[PDB]
From Swiss-Prot:
Entry annotation: catalytic residues: H363 (charge relay system), D419 (charge relay system), S525 (charge relay system)
Protein name: Prothrombin
Activity modulation comment: Activity is promoted in the presence of negatively charged surfaces, such as polyphosphate and dextran sulfate. Inhibited by SERPINA5.
Organism, as annotated: Homo sapiens (Human)
Domain Peptidase S1, chain residue ranges per copy: 321-575
Amino acid sequence: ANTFLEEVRKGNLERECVEETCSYEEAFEALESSTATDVFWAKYTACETARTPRDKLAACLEGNCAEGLGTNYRGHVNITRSGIECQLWRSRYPHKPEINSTTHPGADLQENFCRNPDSSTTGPWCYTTDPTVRRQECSIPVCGQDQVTVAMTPRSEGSSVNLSPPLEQCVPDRGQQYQGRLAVTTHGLPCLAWASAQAKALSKHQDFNSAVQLVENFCRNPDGDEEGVWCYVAGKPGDFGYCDLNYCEEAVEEETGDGLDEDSDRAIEGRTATSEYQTFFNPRTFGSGEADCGLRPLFEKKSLEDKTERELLESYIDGRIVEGSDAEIGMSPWQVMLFRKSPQELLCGASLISDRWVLTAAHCLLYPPWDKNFTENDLLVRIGKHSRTRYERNIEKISMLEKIYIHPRYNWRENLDRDIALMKLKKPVAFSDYIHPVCLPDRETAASLLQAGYKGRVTGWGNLKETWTANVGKGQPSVLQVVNLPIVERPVCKDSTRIRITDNMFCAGYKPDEGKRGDACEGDSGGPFVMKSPFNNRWYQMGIVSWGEGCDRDGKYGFYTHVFRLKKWIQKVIDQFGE
Ligand SMILES: [Ca+2]
Ligand SMILES: [Ca+2]
Ligand SMILES: [Ca+2]
Ligand SMILES: [Ca+2]
Ligand SMILES: [Ca+2]
Ligand SMILES: [Ca+2]
């Protein structure tokens, strides 16, 4: 700085910038690289509060503490004032950051380490991994004294003392024979009387088991829905609402058939087995397509199997990881894109399920952390596509929807449980070569698919990659990305994740090798996971694609939400308009 005679010799960054008072210039002279130099400049603007004295600046350049509001904080704390783990700073999962590393890299916002880029009154604050807390302040040690930026109050787990622990058994038989006194639904709204006029009118043509003496107003499921217990509510005709019960983890994954002979070698493939498929919905109200499910005229009528089907055996060479490749045109007539009318922006994906219904995930429709409230006139569908970028009027079609039904058990705040949404097509869709629905595995068929050794298939166009993985370098693909993933073992699916994953979701993907971000984070949100059943040469869609932990950090497969518990659910919707 001063003593201009000094402005001849080689100056040490310390000797010219600290104790004296240097600008960017003498610093640069000392260093000669604008990257770390402007790291130093970012500190300097931050150390504007740390210009004097010496230590004040030595520590400020050290980076081990937050200056009050923490604009200087360059540490690595991943806990909020309550200890909540912070979200990815660069990405918007699960809440959109107003000011981020693209905006203020001068605060050096790392992956999830606690920061303060906007100089808000909260001090060091981070968007949190838990969707419940959009922004929570981080307790960061104070520069110069044994203090922190905000009070630390970790939310430690509650003891099992003040709460009366229920020894009551979990509800068996999917709540068909439940014998408690439950009187609260998902919203807490009480039910009506069973013998009411609306309830009788709606359940006149509903398949109920008369063995259950339907009690006064308790949650009863005489239709044997595999999702849980439900009861009628007032309002619009035909409506209902599921209740809240502590169900057993009676997942189909560990259900081994009581007829599976102990001779599991030289397995008999489809051997002239005319495996009829039993339609479960009402064809008058659900529409056609269930009968023609799983039969591709280009494949089933041509006796052709896709060049990606030859991998369907899990008996490949050591099951080595294979990256995805482009599929044949017309091999995915059901793949649909959920799009925004204004602006025309890529939002989500799905698969066509019938001639009148479109099934997607519940998170794609309602994600309030992104100011999203999507109604009938703010959603559109693009069907029969091979490329997104082109306008394929002859093959791809653009359609609107009429009514939207969301699942009552929608829990996006924690784990995207019951990621289910059903929207009725506004215009009838004509069956052709590039338009087709899919089958829906029941309990036993899906059990056979899981335990007999068959791979599933997920189709998507990489919307999740643009939305959630903010790394610049992997753009939105132009071709449909199709990935074959077998089933994952349940302790493997549960142990490596901290979030309580419900039995309505499951993992799909190979073991993650060290040193890479896996292939489970490819495709659109809401995609289908389809598996081919050897009995009838057809394809059954197990569920819906949602967000996966494999994107944000390594070591995770794709997490997808089941649909086999929703059959009895789906009918309950159409009977509202099926009169
Ligand atoms: Ca000087
Ligand atoms: Ca100088
Ligand atoms: Ca000097
Ligand atoms: Ca100099
Ligand atoms: Ca000079
Ligand atoms: Ca010195």
